[model samples]
Structures are given as C-alpha cells and as structure tokens.
Target chain A: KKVVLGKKGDTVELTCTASQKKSIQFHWKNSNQIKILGNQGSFLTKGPSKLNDRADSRRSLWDQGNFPLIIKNLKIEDSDTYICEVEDQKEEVQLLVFGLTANSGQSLTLTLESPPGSSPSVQCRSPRGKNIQGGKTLSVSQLELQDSGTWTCTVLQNQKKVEFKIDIVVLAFQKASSIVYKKEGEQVEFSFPLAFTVEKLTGSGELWWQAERASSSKSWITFDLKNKEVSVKRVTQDPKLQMGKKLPLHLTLPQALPQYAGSGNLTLALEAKTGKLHQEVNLVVMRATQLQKNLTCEVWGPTSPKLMLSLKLENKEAKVSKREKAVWVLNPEAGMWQCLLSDSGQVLLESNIKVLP
Target chain B: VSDVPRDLEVVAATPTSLLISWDAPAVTVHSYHIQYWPLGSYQRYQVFSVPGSKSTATISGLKPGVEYQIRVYAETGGADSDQSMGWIQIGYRTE
Candidate 1:
C-alpha cells in the first residue's frame, strides 16, 4: 500500500511494480470503481490508448506506457482509492488532495519545524513580492488576496540554520461556500464569526444564507425587463422592504406581452453588494402563469432594412427569422420567449415574453 | 467555508414553466445556479441563474409532464467567486 499526497492541480504517476514483464496484464481503477486504464496486452505497447471516460482528459499512459497512470490536472474529487492489479496481485494507492485556494475571514496554520526551534521564524512574500512576518506556526486571520504569497522560513538544526519556503495562493472565493461534515452528535448552534454557518449536511435541506465576515453591505438590486442594467442597496437587520432612491417614479413594467398579468409576469430583484446606485425593481415574485399555449410574435419596428421577428426559446433557437408573414404563432411548451426585431441582420430591439393568456 | 444549500421545491408555473425555489443558505451567497435535465434521458443539462437574495425563479419552456433532475448551487456574493457544495439531483415533475 502506498499513499501519495498532492495538491489539487498537481499531476501524478501511479505505477504498480515488483514489477512487470512477459505476457502481463494490468488494470488501474479509482475510488469510483471507474477504471483509469488497463487491459490484457503487451504491458509495454498496444492497449486502449485513452482514458475510459470521454469527459476525463487528464489521465493517460505516459512515457509510452512506461508509466501506467499519468493523471494530470487532478481535482478534489480525484482524491480516492486507486487500485492497480496484475492478475490477482494488487497494489493500493491512496491519493489525498489539498488545496491552496485560500480566502479572507478564514484561518490557516502551518508548522515550520518538528520540535525544537529556538531561533526560527517565517516571512511571507506577496504576489507583488512584498514581504511580511509569519510566525513558526504560520497562523493567519482575516487574510486577503494581497496576502497571498510564498513564505520563507529559517530552520535551525544542529546549531545550523537553513532557509526554506512555503507558498500560499490566497484567492477570493465565495463566502460561506464550503462543505462542512458534522459527524452526528456535533454542535449545530453557532453563527460563523459574522454571517452564518451550516452544520449538518445531506442529500436534502433548505437553502439559507449563513456565514461570517460578510462585513460588506448587502442589498437587492433591480434589472430592466427588456434592456438589463443595475442597482445596489443593503437589507437592514429587520429585513424590511424599504425602498431606496435610484429608480424612476411610476415605472411601468415591460414584458414581451403585457396584455395579461402572468406569462413572464415574473420580475427580478438581484441581491447585489455595491453602492453604485440603482434600477427600478419590485420584489413582487409573481407565480408562473398557466397559459403556455400558442402566441403570435409580431414586432412593430423599423422597416428601413425590413425588420424581421424572431423567437428565442430555452434551446436558444429562433426557427423562423425573416418571415414571409410577420406573424409567427408559436408554442413555448414551457419557458420564456424573446421577441426580437432585427434589420435583416443585427438585433435592433428585443423583448422577453413570459406570459400568454 | 460555504455550506450545502437545501430545501429545493418546484411547482408548475405554466405548461412550459415551473417555479423552482430553495431555502437561502446560511452562508453568504451572492447568487444561485440551478441545473435541470430530463429524468433518465440523454438531453443535455440546462442552467438557470438567479441572485442569492431571490430564492424563487420561474423555469420556462420545458417539456410538460416530464420528470426532471434539478440541482441548485450556491456561490458567494460580492467579489467572492467560489463554488460551494450543491445538493445532488433532486427530482421534480412538470405539468
């Protein structure tokens, strides 16, 4: 049994030795019970040349099969049990993957030495090569992107000091975004430093916002119906529907069709985090309309270049464009419809139709 | 770190539309991405995106009466752009 520990993006080679030769066959499998590569043929030459899964483009028989498994661009999911078998004899490879992607509002601790270290410390060099002091344990709090860099540590052994380095790729990742496994009987009632934290996880549950250090102001912004744009505001402690001033007064709603109140009767309010001002939007989340029958798509636009009408559906297709007749009676079956006006070329005007009654 | 989002629910909005929603995560999520594909079919997966503030969305132009496997993923808000854990395929049926 062999254990190989590597970072997420590192490439590795898995060889089952003791060794190989004449009339030999080998099979390599992963934790998913999926075969990486293997077959009965000359272990030195002709065999299935590709990885088993088509979507998987990382692994291959490297060095002309000189190396059994040369898996590249490893992912977090790739950390698992890999078994290499040759006619009943098997060698197990346990792969463990660690990540370098670090973020703010998180804690990190790394040790520089084993036991005794009287005069040894660490200094981190940022992406810009700027430096900072990191102690022996290399602990960091409220870390930011600019703090990402390599750390140089002076290790003292046998009255001699040696310089060593460790690198951290501190990046900005979504807050409160991680899987925490709480083996039953663990505590469940504690908010993350600021936002909130999730405890027990499984196949099902409610989606809630919980985390720490989302010190940034949060708000719900509005986007235009036909032509989209932006806005920003924060939700107060009470979670009230207090309207902020960045929108036009008496804003009329625009839909592909406004005759009835349902189809695309839905409006959107984006939970934006900024202070750049606004777009007129209401959080009225109207239910989906029940009428998805047939509808006519007729656009009233310029005829200079002979404007044509098109419908953009879920499949991203507009089967009929420059129609002989401007009226296209179509069915949405289920989805939103886009009424496009084009001058026999680029789109000049576009309207979304989410209602049909 | 982010936690797994939960409480996925879906209802028929129209013959071609279904209202899908989930509980907002306890973490700081800026946006949510939902994926749906026909149940037991070879059709490619379709993705719908929404702001984290808004939990409910209308998925339109779908095959009526067909079962679909839908999943929701949570992403951090603001400048944070990390992929949090998402629930596995949950089943939902259309009109």
Candidate 2:
C-alpha cells in the first residue's frame, strides 16, 4: 500500500507498472472493492460513479505497459483508499487532504517558480476574479476577508499542464487592551466591548479565565445571548455558579488576595450569528496595605522605588514618608481613604480604605 | 496630577491623518498632550495639546505605511510643581 498527502484542490496520480505487456488490461476499485472503471482490450467502461468525470486513466500509459489513475480538484471527501489492478498484479493507494490559513486585511504574494524550458504560460485565478499583479510574482496589496477562497495556478509546458490549488483562509481579530494593575481589597471590573466588523452574537458563547499559580487552574463561563442564560464552571470540576439575563462577562474581584497576586488571562469566544470571534485580555494583581490617620502601620512586601505610594483623602493629598519600609500618617478626618501607587504619572495601584468616627 | 485616560481607540486612519479618541478618566485633570512619532525613529515626535473637555483629536501630516506610537497625558495646575501625571500609550498603523 502506498500513502499520499495533498492539500485541498491538489491533483494526485497513482501508477501501476504492468508485469506482462501482452494483452494488457486495467481495473480500478474504490475502498469498498466496488469496481469503478476498467479497460478491456480497445474498449473503456466506467461504472455509475459520481467521480467518473474527476477520475482519468491514461490509455497511452496502459498501451506502453503502464497503468496509472489520476484524480484532480481534490476535496476533503476524496481522502480514502483505492485499489488499482492490472491483470494479476494489484496496487493500493491512499489519499490525505489538508488546508492552509492566512489573516484578514493582510497582503499576500504568491510566486510560481517554474523551470525555464520554454516560457510556461502561467495563469492564476480566484473565484472573486482578482486581478493578478506582478510578472512572476502574484501580489495583492490589501486582501479583504471575502477574498479568501480556492485559487488555481496553472503552468503550461510542452503542451502539458501542471496545476496547483491553494485554499486560502482568512481569520478575524480585534484590538485588545491589557489591564495594567489592580490593588488588593478593591472592587475592580474588566469588560470587553463587542465592537467590530464581525458578526453579532446569536448563540451561546464561551469564556475562559486562567490564573498562573503553583498549579495552573482554569474557569469556564458559558453565555447564551439568545436566551440570556449563563453558567460558570471551573475546569475539571463541577459547575459552580449559574445566572440568567445578565452574564458575569464583567469580572470583578471584590477583594484581591495575596494568593491571587500574579498574572492571569481572560478569553471570550462569541458564537456570532454567522461566525465566531475571540477576544483575550491579561491581568496583573498586586498586594496593597491601608493606613489610617496617625496610624503607624508596616507595609510588608516587595516595593519598587520607581513607583511612589501616596495617600489621598477628601480633596487634599497627605504626605507619605518612605524608607526601608512604606509608612503613612493619616489626617484627623473620617472619609474614604485611597493609597495610590504611581510610576511617574501612571496609576499602578489604588488601595481603598474607609475611615470611621 | 490627573488619572490616565481609558478605552483609547483609533476611530479613523488614512494615508495622511489619524483620529484617536478615548474615555475620560474618573479623576480630575486639565488639558491633554498627545505625543506621537513613527516607531523605530529617533526622539522626533509631533505633539498636540487639546482642551480637557475634548475627548477626541485628529493628527495630520503623517506619512503613509508607517507605524506610530501615540501617548496621551493629562496636564493640571499652573505652577511647575502642579501638572497632569501618568500616560497611556497606544499604537496604530497607517494604510
């Protein structure tokens, strides 16, 4: 048995060398051993096969003591085994098909490097009728998402032709922003806005969250936009949370913990009315300490001098004294206090605390 | 100092101009300074100062086929010690 690998739209040929040249005959059968085609003396007979037009046998090769079967314009369903028999000798052939992918709104250049025997007339065409640019190189300055399809490149040599079929796939993507930082003991929420040229949500979509720790764990959230139903489950575990009407798409960690002091990732897969879309975001949770007015508290943790931690209350800024350890003295006022850790002008952390009478 | 702007996005992009917009931060601040230049280039940059009340700005005189890094900073105060701090950087490519 012989194996062959090919991409979709490719052509494959199966060859069988005849052991006896006298009174040569050929027969082809599918994987079911059902006879498909054969050559008896000077007559050619074909079965009631759907692939009869796509299947070709070289009568010239058979007369030269060689029997070969050729199949063109390959499809995924054509991936199967076949048997070719010439008199007493039998041969088995197998076919495997695959695909290729590209990104949307990107440029592509396909070059056909044919050997220089005679100027082989090269022709390339797509279903969308795109104009071929460049002499030897095919260039599309900007490719649209709909421009992805099966393209055929043909080279003619000595009145014989060689064809190449490529299935170009274009993927859709959106711009995503990262969560810079979040402080412990605070209410933080992250929301992903569905604003793109892609399709709208019609069916249930999937959301995944992973936190990096000693043993990485994942949480799955499924949402049905059509029914307004949602379910949350931790992977490898039972479903833990469920809701209706409003999905927990807006994730909020009411209180950040030291155990959650690391980077995490969130991914959302929306089953759109026509297709699917994916969005991802990253999170960095930091540890924080809260100090009240005139309170001497020790902030025990790693700190970067590049980032300054200050306390803000009401509409006035309080002085923050920093040394080997971070310490802050609060004013004699009762309100909501905030410790802002900033690098230059960027706020890296905002730890909130409530001051009572 | 003012809080950094959030939800920055490229609303429009052309061969010679780009329009960027953002959501106002919760904290109070003055005007904004937009500094942008082609990536991998030297210290060369084009700067623009817009009123704090405006949420969008259109940058012109840009070269085509160039990737630019844009940063927005909120400014506050009249004295040297008082001003807007912190910035958020966003990237975009022109067609």
Candidate 3:
C-alpha cells in the first residue's frame, strides 16, 4: 500500500486494475473495514453510506478499464487506507488528510517563502465574509468559534494574484484567561467544546472530562460525559457544576462553591479511532472579597521558590509583594486588590482583597 | 527573577495590529515587554510593555502585508530588571 497526502478540499484518485478487464467485480473497503464502494460492470453500484453520510456524495467509482475510486473534497476524516478487491487480486491505497489547527486566542500565520522574492499584496477573507488586506506575511490573530471555516487568501504582486484557501479548525477550552474569579449571587460557566471535534473525525467516540485540584494528586475525579461513567468520585464541583440547561458542556458554577471553588485543572478529552484529542485549563476560581485587618496569603503546594506571592491592583500594578515566610504578610492596601500564589507563570491561587480602612 | 509566561496566544489580529496575550502571572513582579519589527528588514524593533496583572497587549501602528517577528520578555521582581525572564518568540503573520 502506498500513502497519499491530500489537502482538506482537494480531489484524489486511487487506481486499480485486474489481470483481465473482462466483466468482473470491483469492491473497496477502508481501514475500518467499512465498505466504501462496490461496482460490477456498470449496472450494480454501492456507495460510502456506512463510512459517513457525506461520504456518498464525495466518492465516485468509475468504469471503462481501470476501476478507480475518485474521492473529492477530502476531510480529515477521510484519512484512511482503502483496499480494492478484484476476484483474488487486491490493491491498497492509504489516504491521509491535512488541514490547519489553532487555539482559541491564538493567531494563524500565513507565509510565502522559498519564493518571497517579490512582495505581494494579500487579501484575507474569513468564513463570514470579513476581509483583511496585508503583505508578504499576514498574521491572523485572535481567532474564535466564529472564525472557524475555510479562509481565502489572494496574494497579488505586480498586478498579479496568487489565490489560495485555508481550512481552519479552532480549539477552545484551554483559553488564555483560564484563571477566573467567582461572583456572588451569580453563576460562572465554563463551556466544554466538542461539536467541532465530532464533526471533524469519522470514528470519534466517547466524551470524557476530568477535574483535578492543585492541592493534591489524590483529589482526582474524572467522568465520561457521554457514557455517564465515573472514575473515582465527583469533588467540590458537586455544588454548582451544572452541565448546562441548553447546551451540552456548559459547566455552570455559583459563588457558593464550598463544594467546587478554588484552583483546579479541568480536562476535556475525546477518543478517536486513530488517536485521542484533549483540552485542559488550569482554572483558578476565587471568591470576590475577603475583608479583614491583615491579609494572609497561601497556596496548596509545599514551601518553594517556584511559587511566589504576588499582588494585583486596580491599575493593574502587580509584583512580588513580600514573602518572608510561607505565609506572607500584607502591609496596607485599600481598594480592590488580589493576592496570587503563582506557580511558575500559572496562577495557582488568587484571593480578592477588598481592603476598607 | 521569573519564569517565562506560558500559554501565549494571539488573541486577535488585523492587517496592521495584533492583539496578543499570555497567561497572567499570579506571584508578583511582572512587567512584560513586547517587541516587534517587520521580518527581514531594517525598520528595527517596535516595542511596548504590559503589567503582569494584565495578560494582554496589542502591537499596532503596523504596515499591512508585511510579516513581523514578535518577542516578549518579563522583568520580574521590584528591581530585578537585569535578571529578566527569557524571551518567548512568536510569529505575528497578517490576515
């Protein structure tokens, strides 16, 4: 079997021939052993009904001499090996699909090198018909769900244009602002996304999620969101961890988080036939206020320099406040302030301090 | 002084600007310096700064169709500017 690399929206053909072209049967099946196409002469024919609903419209089993499977508009799910059987003879063809994958708050870069001699004017268009004009290197930043689709790029130099399309799939969950603060009498929701994942892969299966606290490794509780299977048991999330009234993975929480408040890691993962895809966020959930004479700050981990006690002000002035001991002391600060127990760059803990003199 | 911030994201991009962000620091002294310049040209470096508390910054006043090399570093501690964190670089391509 020979491997073929195909783009997201391109056409591909797999050629096969038998010892004799005389009236005979031609059958094809993918790596999953699902029947893709079957043709005997030209009277009887079958399609990729079992592969996927859209597969039938995208595949063609042609006739005349060599019976080949002509597949068009390929998707990542089309990445599979197909075997053609003619009597006892067989021919194998492996198809691999490719496209662009980006994060929630990240930008996708467009390059034109190896032949960047002439600078070109580039016009970029999103799925919803938004346009941007740029040159040589265009950086499409700050992408989200609304920007998920094929983008068009028109590169023009000296009155000429080089046009191309890019299929972009955006993944959220582990967003930049994974760290969050709790609000009283209000519900905070963390939406778990997987519709795009399910739409991308053909053999996708079993939705799952895991909730782990930063305090200790033992506080692990995972759930298979689809099969309703539990690993260990649910933790503090039991308080307001509502999985949305409308949407599927909209994880809703309230301020009364004695059950689910604090900094923890929430993971959303899925199983595919080939490999698995998972998304995570070191979500730090804190209460809005704590009024007192002195502000005491601390974290779950042991005493180490890796973790630092810091402060953030209304003007956004942040720095290592003080750390004489594992328990840090706050001199005096009025107005809205936040104490952060930061591990490396990830904010492990945050305490909203409403200092009223 | 401090570790480089993780989870750098280009939150938004335009032909002439890039709205970028990184994981916000929790422990303290963080002055993120953002620098950028047109790729492979003599326009030199364009720069700005972001408070550690504020995780996002924008690189604006740019020319379209030109690719830019962007690098950000954090100066941690009150006065440990000399021992700033290492640079984390990213490509800010246009849309």
Candidate 1 on B1-95: residue-level lDDT in tens? 44556545443344577776667656777777776767433124577678778878788778876665566677765434354533422454455
Candidate 1 TM-score, C-alpha based: 0.27
Q: Which stretches of candidate 2 lie over 4 Å from their true place?
A: A1-173, A180-183, A196-199, A203-212, A220-244, A270-278, A282-338, A351-357, B1-95
Query: What is the per-residue lDDT of model 2 for residues B1-95, given as tens digits with 9 covering 90 to 100?
Result: 34667655566667798888877775655787787867533135567789888999999998887767676777555545643354555455575
True C-alpha contacts between chains kept, each model in order = 0.00, 0.00, 0.00
- How do the residues A1-357 of candidate 1 rate in per-residue lDDT, one tens digit apiece? 776654333346666653433334556666667656644443333234243432122223432333356655444455567777666567888755433221113444544423222344445554445455655455565554334444444443333443444444332232212221111122211111111111111111011231122432233223231111112223334222223222211122222221111111112222243222211111111111224466655432113344455666646687556643254545554467666655553454455567534
Please give me the DockQ of candidate 2 compared with the native complex.
0.01
Ten-residue stretch with the least lDDT total in model 1 chain A? A198-207
Candidate order by DockQ, decreasing, is 1, 3, 2
| Model 2 score (lDDT) | 0.55
Could you report the Cα RMSD, in angstroms, for every candidate shown?
Answer: 23.6, 27.2, 23.9
Task: List model 1's recovered fraction of native interface contacts, to 2 decimals.
Answer: 0.00
lDDT per residue for candidate 3 within A161-194, as digits (tens), equals 4455545534554353233333234566554444
* Docking class for candidate 2: incorrect
What local lDDT score does residue A232 receive in model 2, on the 0 to 100 scale?
A: 44
Interface RMSD of each: 17.4, 17.9, 14.8
Q: With candidate 1 superimposed using the best TM-score fit, by how many Å does residue A65's alpha carbon deviate from the native? A: 5.9
- What TM-score would each prediction reach against the true structure? 0.27, 0.29, 0.32
List DockQ, one per candidate, in order.
Answer: 0.02, 0.01, 0.01
Provide the overall lDDT of each model, using Cα atoms, as 2-decimal numbers: 0.43, 0.55, 0.53
After superposing candidate 3, which stretches have Cα over 4 Å from the reference?
A: A1-107, A110-169, A172-187, A195-237, A245-248, A256-277, A287-290, A296-309, A312-320, A323-354, B1-95
